[PDB]
């Protein structure tokens, strides 16, 4: 799935089929280094590109005065009442008016979507 | 200045 680099020249490896043993390899084109492929998957493309934006949401966002917050939804970890909520804030999000929530109070940063 | 169907 991910990209891995050569251990000699730190260039980009490329996948190559081993014709004898039928084992996927990654070989650097600028040298002779070769490493067997462990993942066995190469090119994955998510056309719907459904990605949880909770990975793209920063905890620091809880410090923004310009965002709205409610005391209705408490946090799961610490049970803090303040929770600052906001929409996708992303282009090409398909159609999503879902509210994402970020916990206020220091260092918790827990994010839930309801 | 009125609405979406009117004028601006």
């Amino acid at each position: 799935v991910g990209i891995r680099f050569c251990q000699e020249c730190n260039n980009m490896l490329y996948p190559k089929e081993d014709k004898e043993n039928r084992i996927l390899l990654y070989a650097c084109r600028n040298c002779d280094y070769q490493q067997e492929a462990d993942n066995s998957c190469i090119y994955v493309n998510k056309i719907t590109h459904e990605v949880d934006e909770l990975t793209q949401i920063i905890a620091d966002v809880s410090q923004d005065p310009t965002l709205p917050r409610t005391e209705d939804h408490p946090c799961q970890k610490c049970g803090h009442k303040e929770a600052v909520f906001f929409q996708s804030h992303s282009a090409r999000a398909e159609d999503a008016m879902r509210l994402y929530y970020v916990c206020t109070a220091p260092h918790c940063g827990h994010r839930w979507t309801e | 200045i009125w609405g979406i169907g009117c004028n601006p």
Partner: protein, 144 residues
């Protein structure tokens, strides 16, 4: 000629008293606006809870915008109708609109009841600032 001299007799004018409506009319306009704002709040809550479902040929954003615009326009029309009911026979805004000399019922309504939705490029006022319309409003506020 003859109608202008009769007008010298009868006379015609426009004043503040034409713009003023009954107290009951103003109360009804306020109640209609309150109900519309509450309905827009309800629609926004439905969208936030993901209850809203896209209208065919429209995205969820587009269908939400259309529903909110419909609610706001219906409230605006109802307030305008209340203002126009308030108008007396002697009212001179109504005189000019009825004669067709100048003005329209839209102008009477805006003068007396509600100016209405301000739309740029066929959409409500855009989020010119970062995810908000003006710095005074909180981010992601789709209310009226």
């Amino acid at each position: 000629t003859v109608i202008n001299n009769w007008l010298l007799i009868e006379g015609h004018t426009i004043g503040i008293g034409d713009s003023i409506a009954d107290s009951k009319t103003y109360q009804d306009i306020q109640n209609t606006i309150k109900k519309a704002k509450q309905d827009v709040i309800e629609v926004i809550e439905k969208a936030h809870n993901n209850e809203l479902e896209p209208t065919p040929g429209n995205t969820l954003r587009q269908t939400f915008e259309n529903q909110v615009n419909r609610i706001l326009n219906d409230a605006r029309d109802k307030t305008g109708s209340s203002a126009q009911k308030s108008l007396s026979e002697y009212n001179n805004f109504k005189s000019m609109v009825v004669s067709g000399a100048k003005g329209s019922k839209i102008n009477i309504s805006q003068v007396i009841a509600v100016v209405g939705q301000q739309n740029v490029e066929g959409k409500r006022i855009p989020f010119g600032f970062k995810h908000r319309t003006l710095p005074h409003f909180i981010k992601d506020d789709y209310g009226p």
